[PDB]
Subunit: 455 residues, 4 copies
């Protein structure tokens, strides 16, 4: 009866993406807001800006509010939100309540300083930044790196296996299966590196970004330095100093754009794998409800759909998050509640990709037969050699010779024997030893050396 859920995220695919609810769910949002509030009061206590330090034990009681958050804690916040119709204000009340309800006298004194000087977005943006960072570092990017590792394994394992290339869908100079996978490794590797280099930013600046309240409360405090310390020490966050009521969200747009480019590469992979399978060059480990031996690339297909959905959210984010009327409009708040959904679609797709990739094997006989039926792809190296030995208009010579004939091995090798005999005999012999399977350039070297040679 998670089966009665409308979103396939919380419905059909909940098993695939459930680990995300610790980062993104209203429960996790409430939890992290409580933590941010508690950490702020702990920092005010540390700094003694407004009161003398509470007792060592009162500090641990203050801590425990943030380190032991229960389901009932969450229900309590929701209960209060029914009164307030303000979700962050409900958390202030909750934290003050737990302080009132504590034994401690010093804690009863300092409870009025909960949320002191803050605006709601001070709490929210840190909650989101810490959840997003931890989600990507602990769940989403590791899943991407698993796909990357499997592509590298495939690149090395099949580095030598000749494969007929297709440009415009049609036969072209050979590659190897390893090399084609190496190409996807190299791109995913680059995408992961760009994404990991985006800095997750936060701010803590009050009503409109200017420390208005803070300046009145404590005129000799350098609030820019004090907040930078707060965010670094309590959250390991970079501080984006310039903001209105909202953090600008540009780092979210950067991350999402990065993930969206990764997703594009993965869609490219999914469709190529589908096409290799269509052409019977790859086989899948055991399907069709009517044909007993038919096995379909349904993991790649499911992945392709969910990568497109993830990218829809990601385009929405980068398009709408950067704009907010004056010192803010609230339309960004609901949009941001869908960051979790966007990364769920990524995770569903990435896990399907992994499942698909682990099912594939090469079909050597089919790979070989295709290559041996596509001798026309040897046109270029014959011309290249002819030209190296001063032949003029090599392509026209081959064109003339093959005119009105169906090009095959016999014709290509007759062309070498009777039209290239002017070459040194060792060069002629090497032309005669070339096959579409052996004309693969440095595909094998490049495939097995991709870890080292990719930028």
């Amino acid at each position: 009866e998670h089966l009665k859920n409308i979103s396939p995220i919380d419905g059909r695919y909940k098993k695939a993406c459930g680990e995300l609810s610790a980062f993104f769910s209203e429960h996790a949002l409430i939890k992290h807001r409580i933590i941010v509030e508690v950490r702020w009061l702990l920092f005010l206590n540390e700094e003694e800006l407004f009161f003398e330090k509470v007792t060592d034990h009162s500090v641990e009681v203050l801590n425990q509010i943030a380190t032991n958050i229960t389901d009932s804690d969450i229900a309590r916040v929701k209960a209060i939100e029914e009164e307030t119709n303000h979700d962050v204000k409900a958390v202030e009340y909750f934290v003050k309540e737990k302080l009132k309800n504590s034994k401690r006298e010093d804690l009863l004194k300092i409870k009025e300083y909960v949320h002191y000087l803050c605006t709601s977005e001070d709490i929210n943006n840190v909650a989101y930044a810490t959840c997003l960072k931890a989600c990507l570092n602990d769940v989403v990017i590791p899943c991407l790196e698993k796909i990357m590792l499997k592509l590298k394994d495939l690149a090395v394992e099949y580095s030598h296996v000749p494969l007929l290339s297709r440009t415009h869908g049609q036969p072209a100079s050979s590659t190897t299966f390893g090399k084609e996978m190496a190409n996807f490794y190299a791109r995913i590797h680059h995408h992961v590196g760009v994404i990991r280099r985006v800095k997750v930013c936060a701010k803590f600046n009050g009503a409109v970004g200017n420390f208005n309240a803070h300046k009145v409360a404590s005129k000799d405090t350098d609030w820019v330095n004090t907040i930078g310390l707060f965010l670094k020490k309590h959250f390991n966050l970079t501080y984006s100093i310039y903001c209105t009521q909202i953090q600008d969200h540009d780092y979210i747009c950067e991350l999402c754009d990065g993930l969206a480019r990764a997703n594009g590469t993965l869609i490219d992979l999914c469709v190529d794998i589908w096409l290799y399978i269509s052409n019977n060059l790859l086989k899948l480990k055991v399907g069709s409800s009517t044909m007993p031996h038919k096995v379909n690339p349904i993991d790649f297909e499911n992945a392709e759909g969910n990568l497109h959905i993830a990218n829809a959210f990601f385009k929405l984010f980068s398009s709408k998050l950067p704009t907010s009327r004056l010192q803010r409009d609230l339309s960004d708040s609901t949009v941001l509640r869908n960051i979790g959904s966007s990364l769920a679609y990524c995770l569903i797709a990435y896990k399907s990709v992994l499942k698909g990739l682990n099912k594939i094997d090469i079909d050597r006989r089919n790979l070989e037969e295709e290559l041996n039926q596509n001798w026309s792809t040897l046109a270029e190296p014959i011309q290249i050699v002819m030209k190296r030995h001063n032949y003029v208009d090599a392509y026209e010579e081959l064109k003339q010779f093959t005119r009105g004939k169906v090009i095959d091995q016999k014709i290509m090798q007759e062309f070498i024997k009777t039209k290239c005999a002017f070459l040194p005999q060792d060069v002629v012999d090497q032309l005669l030893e070339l096959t579409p399977a052996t004309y693969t350039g440095y595909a094998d070297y490049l495939a097995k050396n991709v870890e080292r040679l990719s930028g």
Copy 2:
């Protein structure tokens, strides 16, 4: 506990969109697939194409597999699916086992005909078609029609209330608040009419759309006509004859495009109401300021309409393409139709909540109009021209050079520069104010239902 859900659809906003799960959830899809399977067998029984009509009571027993589907039945399908890793197959197995266990001879006889001649998409597309049609007809469009009704109520109630227009954000010829709401009514009315006219289509054509199986099974049956009947009689659906393994989905794209255009109009409305409120011209029925009331319903709507539209653009771009006789990437995409409509419903309910908080601020409306006498420049020029004056604009410009234009200056222009006019015309110009220069705004606002057209 729904608080641990990742999607805001099933978490924070569950209350606002929960009525959608009867149409769109895996439970709803399972339920409707079972119904399609049962009705196909009922139809084969009616038609006697492959066996003689079963007993009257056996057709009652068959129908009850469809008319009493429980959470238990749903969990059973899911259980079978762990084995099959094929969802529709798991429904075939389920209907068969209900038939095996029925304690009816003639039903044991016909159970091998469950899903006879069908492909899974025959079942899926009818299930989606009926769910989407019912959802729009019963939940989604009536919610849009409630916004329409409120906009028309606002248009009538405030038809006569003058409002300083703004073009490029700056003062322009007056309108009325009711008229500005009538504009949105006329557009939503048009959109709803377009959406209602989209024909919901379905197919039931076997593996690849060609009745391959059907033709072998019963070579003298006119299957085009038989399926037309099946779809109309059992589901009240329009038959789209041409298909591959999949129904083309073009009608879904059309409905989605239509919804997205209505959403764009509603975004236009949300931002304008926000601007009127910002300019203190409307009032509404803040954690720091004691008397501050913010347009948070309209802001929430605005955000959720953008989200619905992201899905809608996705559907319209990806649904139309499928590799050859189909690739399966559409299956997972279609599972998001309910989410897209949940964003709509959340947004529409926020609009309704916001519109019901609206009141005019008459004093601020009047004060603004009374400080924007420069907007009477055009009617003064219009009337000068009517009485054969040449370059009326340059004359007014000449007169106001270096002056800050206000009431005194504009009425001085009329009295001293327009005195050549008939005195009755002079007198009418001198009675004009920005609040009375509203053209047929009041007329158009009151008559919008009657004049908005199709």
Copy 3:
């Protein structure tokens, strides 16, 4: 040196789309604005709202301003626009000038009534509506209907030609080449009908949509009825009564969405044709710069790109045109100047599709060999017949029999002979006459009857 143009529309592809400049170019916009201004004054003359009718000859002199618009007329408008920095105001001045510069005394009287009561958007929206309507009716939809006719011709011509279907890329029950093309006909036919049914709307309502000026000028005139007459009589346009300073643009969004769905179907076509060619089932009329007999589906590929570009504009339009702050912001004006570009990308793509489709022929031998190597697709009709004669678990019987075997003709027909012998012998004989080429259902009937049977 149209080759120095930045847009490929006015550069590389100008030959393909040049007929559009009569509808959409700054030249055409100026031209149609002049016509709208002249027609308004003609209507004021007809109606005698503000002056007694000019002389019969003065009417023809007034007409000739709109029916003889030259390149120098256009340069003159631009010259004036350098002064005004207002493009419509420059047209008012131009029309007044031509009236001043006319002989006529009555025309010298009425020239002050040029643009009388109008706002600039009154002129613009009618200019755009008439250009858009005429462009779609005369150029864009006829090109689409040409593709539709070619698909119908292909559907009928090849209605009988058996073709191995592929679902998930893999073998499935047969169809015919005609039938697959018939499917595209049926969708394009539906799209064209939806698009032709959108009503092109216009308005003519002054500053803010309310007839403010008009009501003061002529209090007893029913302006709603008078404008409806003006738009019908002078332009054959539907009147959208409700507007601000701008016509709402919703009909443009409807048309563009319609074209975008058509484009999606055509992208589906382009990729399917590419895949049939990849699989050597279709051949192209005569390529590769290195392989002498290679001919690539470059027309389909070029079409696929330009359909995506057209759809980018179309998504932009439906997303941004519906919103405009209060009684308008001007950001819609520049957006609308790209309607022409959007339809140029459509026309480039549609002409490439036509060029590609006229190059295709079937490759019967390849079509036949593939079918005859895919006997596994006969699994379903064997099971269907077994079941009709009371066999239980037919699929499992076939599965058991083929276990560990490579399914081929011999195995499938041995299954019929030795596992289906319980069937009436006439049914057994019909099973034994079935081939993948003859198992095509009613594909042939449906393909040749698509004109009549499509909805």
Copy 4:
């Protein structure tokens, strides 16, 4: 006559973006392809991989094919293309015929090596890479940097000018005009830094990316290292080793995404300036009203930034996918990179034109602040709390119940409800006004270049 062009890029806005045609037009692409071909042959000559170094003067003659390309040369390539229907092939033919006609023996000898070992995309991708890099470095980014400079000039000049903030469109704690411009400066500075750090990549790897031809032609050459050298020495480009027939285009997507994020920030700015102007707080340096001046530069920018972003979203979604070792659908898409940057340039030039019309309206700024004393609710509560007051919000709410909050009421609250405060603190509260309650807005605005970070 350019007035007959369909695209506004080459029609109405030709003047604003014409400098782009040197980077992006078919003429520019033809020109750069010729240059790549010539430099490859020059490189084979330097390396002596297939023939001995030609004569000193023959290398001068070869280089001049590249350094003096004319309109005539371009028309010649086009002429050849009518025959070939292959654009790069037409360039091979052109360079060869320049060589055949050169009147040099050693050049007649080596002309068969034009395009040796290459695929057309070897030539195309280097041509695009160099054009895109130069365009961004020389035209596009410097135009963004001019907006940055102006925003910083505004931030400094108006650092101290108080401005009533608006959250949800309604009064909030003050800021300053310079501070609100500093916010945009900091974001554009960040975006420009990201865009500048994208590495422009190229390849030169033959038919399918594997040096198939190269390996057969010269089996002992380290081609990975040789091409690295070619690309760095002749074009100053980074080598992306891994490719199919096509370069992957990922770096184009990254640049485009970066530009699109800068565009979103500039859209945010255009709408905010429009809102400030609407609220009469800024003034600018109408066919009907004689004194009306509209923000048409910002409105034009807003529209063209949406257009640039439509292309950018297109590129990022379609460029990354290519069927197998490539499909040709990317070719026609890449021809639109120049158009996308022309929309950017048009928009950036409109922003610059608008920002240069800006002045503050001090009286209207001051008057608004002086009518919004309710915004001092927070600092009053903050200070009460600091001196141990409990539920300060409820106290102020209690006091203002049923009252329209104004200066008199707020100062009465301080004098009668906050009198328990130290008198110096009371005195400071009584000296606060909404115009002086601006926190560190002035400080942050003046220090933005120094504090915006990377």
